[PDB]
Design a protein around this ligand. Structure first.
Ligand SMILES: *C(=O)c1ccc(-c2ccc(C(=O)OCC)cn2)nc1
Ligand SMILES: *NNC(=O)c1ccc(-c2ccc(C(N)=O)cn2)nc1
Ligand SMILES: C[C@H](Cl)c1ccccc1
Ligand SMILES: C[C@H](Cl)c1ccccc1
Length: 9
């Protein structure tokens, strides 16, 4: 989940 969201940055 972390990576899936972190892509924003
Ligand atoms: C949520 O974005 C997320 C993405 C990816 C993973 C995850 C957990 C474990 C592995 C792993 O063991 O890969 C070995 C090649 C990969 N990706 N967790 C949560
Ligand atoms: N929020 N993160 C990003 O926008 C982001 C853009 C590009 C990359 C990235 C990572 C690795 C490579 C490579 N060729 O190994 C290229 N671009 N990460 C994050
Ligand atoms: C549940 C999280 Cl969002 C996830 C699923 C599949 C691939 C990467 C992340
Ligand atoms: C992105 C993944 Cl499917 C997720 C959504 C909402 C709560 C927890 C995980």
């Amino acid at each position: 989940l972390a990576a899936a969201l972190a892509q924003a940055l």
